[PDB]
Amino acid sequence: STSTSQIAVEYPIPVYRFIVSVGDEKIPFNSVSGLDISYDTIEYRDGVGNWFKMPGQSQSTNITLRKGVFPGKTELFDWINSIQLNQVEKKDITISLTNDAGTELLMTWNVSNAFPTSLTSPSFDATSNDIAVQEITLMADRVIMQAV
Amino acid sequence: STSTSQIAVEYPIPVYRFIVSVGDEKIPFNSVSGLDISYDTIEYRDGVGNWFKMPGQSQSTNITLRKGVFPGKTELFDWINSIQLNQVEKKDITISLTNDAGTELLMTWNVSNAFPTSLTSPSFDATSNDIAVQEITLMADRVIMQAV
């Protein structure tokens, strides 16, 4: 006999309900991938036997967002088309696990200074029953995870 | 109760209905692959701690078009046969997602200066129930995506 407010505190969070917000816009995405912290390890070892292991230089964060093609809207493409030589508008991406008809966040990830590389066009295919989907890849720094 | 003009505005576009047009000709293709933007990333990192990430040098676009073998027609082969030393006729390829019996485009991709490398002959096979298909591979620049 678990109460419905006990499940909100004790139970794990399902992945499939999430909100992605790219800068000021919020746009519906099919899937989000990557988005993990990582560290190189530095190892010193000298002759008397002691072995030092340290966290080292952080690694660059690479995120992949996947989204279907909608008939009026290309604003994933216009972001990657605006790249002149090294100047692009970087913007913050927030992923947020929500409840059904999300008025309440459960977890929140924050990405800083994300800019697009490698927008992937759909694979046109005459014998396929799929939607035209696009992956955009983002390079960024500082994934942080926020409670609620 | 979704109206049929609401589906034309809100719903994603299926991949299987498309028009490929190679230069002045338009020819029916079985599948189109590749056709994506990409960028190298330049990373500067100095001693005080700040880490600069930039979009860098663009990558060359490589497209693969697949097409069955028809009895009178070899005009994918005559394009790749006309390569003398570095001189080939480059032409523009446009892919375009359409409706049923296409009188109306929904999305459009444009490829500039595409020229053929690596025409692939069918694999003759006495125990196979397939059509003779050919892949041609194109190297090009500047994929752009146009709305409608």
Place this chain on the structure above:
Amino acid sequence: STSTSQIAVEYPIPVYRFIVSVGDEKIPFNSVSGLDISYDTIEYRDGVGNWFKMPGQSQSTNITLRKGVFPGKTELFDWINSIQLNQVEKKDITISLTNDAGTELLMTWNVSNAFPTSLTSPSFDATSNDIAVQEITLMADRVIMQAV
């Protein structure tokens, strides 16, 4: 969230976009090398212990410009062919890092009184997939670096 005008002020400049201008002409080059200042050091040392280090005589500037062979044009060769005994036309070379489709310079180097030595012909090679390239070497004086 870096703005696109902040990247123009804070971020380092990529090397690959540059304009070379030889005299009144401007000609597209594949790569530019050398082009650095240098100084000999004079060291005095006497018996009481003090050691004087000084900047000394400047060194001659030697630049190497690399360029592919184009079918109608030999004006790197006609410059080095015009050397009669010690008389050659010296001209000023300016390198300039630019933006994409350069209407705006970011940095500028200036070379004075450059004259050609050692034009290098391409290495003809039946098993190579390369372009015919040529290096010209320039001896000059006074590299100066100008902001914008």
Place this chain on the structure above:
Amino acid sequence: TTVTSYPGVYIEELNSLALSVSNSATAVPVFAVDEQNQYISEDNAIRINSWMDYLNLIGNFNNEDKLDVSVRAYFANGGGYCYLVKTTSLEKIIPTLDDVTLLVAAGEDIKTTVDVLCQPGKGLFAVFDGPETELTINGAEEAKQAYTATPFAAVYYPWLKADWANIDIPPSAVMAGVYASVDLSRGVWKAPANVALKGGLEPKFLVTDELQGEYNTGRAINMIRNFSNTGTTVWGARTLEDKDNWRYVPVRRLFNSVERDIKRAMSFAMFEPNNQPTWERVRAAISNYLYSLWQQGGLAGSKEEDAYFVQIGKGITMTQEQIDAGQMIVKVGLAAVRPAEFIILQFTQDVE
């Protein structure tokens, strides 16, 4: 000026001075202009993008004008674009202009307008002049009585003089350019003191160290004095507030700059639905900005959680009553760096 009929080239000979342009994101001054100035009109600000832009508005550079010698000293030190508002309509135009940060009196009485527009909410900092007369260590606490005790104001004493200027230059106009030159090279968090003046400036009155000790304490008057190795230089960073919170102009100008940048990030949250998915986007937008400011060294803290904190919430900051009214309340804290102002040397005769 010059009339061009044939293509050619033209080898006109004229003496006109040209100053290089600078772009400053953080310091946009407004020069108070006296009445009996025939060039600018009442009730509109004239944006002057460069010294050449100013030299098109007036025909000749005038040595006798207080406005002319103050604007040339401003652009020689590295100032960006500025506005020119007349002093009687000055209280109407500064609220219209959005990105104005500095308020500069170029030898003008703005003490009436500074009390009514410099508020804790608004981002205006107001540098103005010291008294033109050569003052004393003796009657020193009466000269500090003339100025208000607001934390948003700094007073720089000696009216500078130059060989090109006939009259003495008000020192606040050269300090609008020093503020823009400091923040571009080292940041807003760095104090504008011990920076040399790029123009041909030197103080009218040489200031003893014992006199500067009088004025630095209560309602502090920063002072521009000459050093033989540095030339002329600015030698103060203190505001007119003596309280330990807002004592220094790098701390007051950092908080003015941070809250203006947070203003722009809260601009996108305007007229969005007032629920939790907005508040976690408001907090994430501020937390990115204060982190990248801490990484530049702007905020003082060894640990990142020591430099700042942001708090939004329905239990924390805003009532259910206040949410229905339409309000959204965020709490931001910062930890600025203070400048080292005194250095005490102890010289010992025996080495041990």
Place this chain on the structure above:
Amino acid sequence: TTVTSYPGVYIEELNSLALSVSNSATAVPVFAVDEQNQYISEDNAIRINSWMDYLNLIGNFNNEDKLDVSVRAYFANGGGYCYLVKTTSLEKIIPTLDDVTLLVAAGEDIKTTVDVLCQPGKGLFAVFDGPETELTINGAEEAKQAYTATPFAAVYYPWLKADWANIDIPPSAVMAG
């Protein structure tokens, strides 16, 4: 507080402390409040959902109040919502409130009310303070004589002190959190 006429944003500068909210299903304390407290009335419990809820009831945080420094130390340690009952009408309101589990003396003499309401049937646990004076190993069995031998009570000795609080904080209010 703040008056809002234009839409805008507002960059008011004020020092007010904010504590994060917690929901606790198992521990709902009741803070005994002395008389000569002008903010709460007799014979009704005032449910305080959060520290911000408490900071609306009283205007300023007061360093001198025994109740103020005890409630702030309670919410800083992670306490949920609590009730505020005055100490003379305390024996009438705790039987009315259903889900009350803890009974906290924030520097108050509740030894009369704890004997009459802490029974084996009722679910009330009652944490209160040790003596404020610095005691001894020498006169030690006399200090244990002052407290009742009920199993529902725990005594935490040293009155805690803080840099924000002027007076010493009763240790039972930090132990409810």
